[PDB]
Structure formats: C-alpha cells, structure tokens
Amino acid sequence: AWVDQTPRSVTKETGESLTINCALKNAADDLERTDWYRTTLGSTNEQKISIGGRYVETVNKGSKSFSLRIRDLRVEDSGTYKCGAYFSDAMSNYSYPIPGEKGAGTVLTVKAA
Numbered sequence: 001a002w003v004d005q006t007p008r009s010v011t012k013e014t015g016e017s018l019t020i021n022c023a024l025k026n027a028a029d030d031l032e033r034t035d036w037y038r039t040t041l042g043s044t045n046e047q048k049i050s051i052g053g054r055y056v057e058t059v060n061k062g063s064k065s066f067s068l069r070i071r072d073l074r075v076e077d078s079g080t081y082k083c084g085a086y087f088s089d090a091m092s093n094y095s096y097p098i099p100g101e102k103g104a105g106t107v108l109t110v111k112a113a
Contacts (some may be wrong), residue, residue, distance in 0.1 A: 001028035003085050005103025016073045022083040022103050023065040031064045033096060035084035040076065048095040049081075073110050083107045 024031055025049040034057065036107070037051040051057050057064040068083065086100035 001025060001087065001099075001101050003083060003103045005083055005106060007106055008104065009107045009109075011109045011111070012073050014074055018070045018073060018095045018106075018108060019067055019068045020081055020106045021024045021065070022085065023063075024085040024087065024101065025064075026063060027085075027087050027101075029089050029099075031059075031061045031066075031085060031087055033084075033086040033100075034059055034066050035086075036068050037082045037084065037102075038079055040079040042080065044083070060082065064094060075110060075112060078108055078110045081108060084113075 003027040004023040
C-alpha cells in the first residue's frame, strides 16, 4: 500500500488554517490507527502531534481517508507534516507493530503579517 498526502507544499499567513488531506491506497485490510508527525524548521526530529485543542483530525475508515486541520497558524508552525496510516486484520496480535505507510509530506511555510 501507500498514502496520498495533499498538499505537497503550501504557504499560509499567521492566524490562518491548514488542512492536510490523506488517503490510504491499495491496502487489503482496514484502517486501524492514524498518526500525524511534524518536524519544525530548525528541528532534527519528527515529533508526534497530539490531537486535541488546535489540532483536529477527521477520519473516514470506510474510505480509508483522513485529514488534519490546524487552527491559528503561526511562526513556529513551519515545517514538514507527515500523516501515518496503520492497517491490519484481527488475527494479527497488536503487541507487534502493524504495517503502515506514511505520506510524502507537506512542507508548510508561515509568514506573519
């Protein structure tokens, strides 16, 4: 399988909103877990976004697509966002990581005004 992330790059202004779409393609089993990662400009490491508050995820397991919205964009918010989509049956014991695929990513630029 693979994931389709959108948009690939985008520029936005302080106090605006971003929506990254993602869709899991050519996957045999159900969508089971979604994750969102972000490496801010200047940062050497992918951190995981904790959904809630200014971050809001919308999932459609049926069509295996999901999206992230980010309220009140800002300076510090610039970097690369990647969605993670994990999938399996029921037979597979979850104490072992399930197959998954990541998006190519969204490089987000924020300027203030």
